[PDB]
Amino acid sequence: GDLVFRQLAPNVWQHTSYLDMPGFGAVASNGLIVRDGGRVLVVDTAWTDDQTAQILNWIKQEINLPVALAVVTHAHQDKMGGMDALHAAGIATYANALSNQLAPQEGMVAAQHSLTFAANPATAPNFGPLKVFYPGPGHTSDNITVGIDGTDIAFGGCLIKDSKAKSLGNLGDADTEHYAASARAFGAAFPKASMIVMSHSAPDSRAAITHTARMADKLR
């Protein structure tokens, strides 16, 4: 139901937001709140439609300036989940073109403009100060990773994950046969992002990247 913020760089806030959906009890999910001059921008929305309202609320209350846009890492209820709020707050949603199709084909909303130049599996567009990067199929075929160039922040998302939870999390509608290839993608798509944020508890280091491909092969 709720929402937490861990300032983890100048310009940049982390979004936590807890529900008892996946990780047994209360689980975590992450987007980031990025600030682009006066503009304000977000990778990914919480679990629900009210958890992305409070992302917006604690933003005017403590960041201030107005949101323009919100990029969704993929067509999964943790990553879309909240959308309708973005729409109602005249926010431009930007799903990657393979997302806007697995959305209403797996119980959810499709983002406004569709992101591309990244449909075909080791690509990137640009974005103000932000970098959308596609790494192939992994956690879902449309999972999408982002770094803010000058913060050594990467966001692999539901793709890269914490050494904390034993295995790899929800791996439903996806491809294991590329995953381990695709965790690499970023390690070298942003060779520098020391601050790898991930969408289930605190940013580890550049070692989850590596361990995940190690891991996805422990269970393969």
Question: Between 23 and 66, whose beta carbon lies closer to Zn ion?
Answer: 23
- For Zn ion, the binding residues in 119-178 under the rule CB under 5 A are 158
- Residue-wise burial string across 40-54, b where 16 or more C-beta atoms lie within 10 A, e elsewhere: bbbbbbbbbbbbbbb
Question: Between 158 and 160, whose beta carbon lies closer to Zn ion?
Answer: 158
d(CA 199, CA 21): 14
> Residue length, the chain?
220
d(CA 72, CA 42): 9
- 46 binding Zn ion? (CB under 5 A): no
Q: Rounded to the nearest 10 degrees, what angle do helices 207-216 and 176-189 cross at? A: 160
Provide, rounded to whole angstroms, the least separation between the CB of residue 111 and Zn ion.
Answer: 15
Question: Between 78 and 204, whose beta carbon lies closer to Zn ion?
Answer: 78
Q: Which residues contact 152 (CB under 8 A, 6 or more apart)?
A: 192, 193, 194, 195
Binding site per annotation, positions for Ca(2+)? 49, 84
Provide, rounded to whole angstroms, the least separation between the CB of residue 212 and Zn ion.
Answer: 13
- For Zn ion, the binding residues in 61-80 under the rule CB under 5 A are 76, 78
Where do we find the tokens 């992994």? Answer: 138
| Cβ contact 77:45 at 8 Å | no
Provide, rounded to whole angstroms, the least separation between the CB of residue 78 and Zn ion.
Answer: 5
Binding site per annotation, positions? 49, 74, 76, 78, 84, 106, 139, 158, 173, 177, 200
Question: Between 28 and 40, whose beta carbon lies closer to Zn ion?
Answer: 28
Binding site per annotation, positions for Zn(2+)? 74, 76, 78, 106, 139, 158, 173, 177, 200
Residues in the site for Zn ion, rule: CB under 5 A?
76, 78, 158
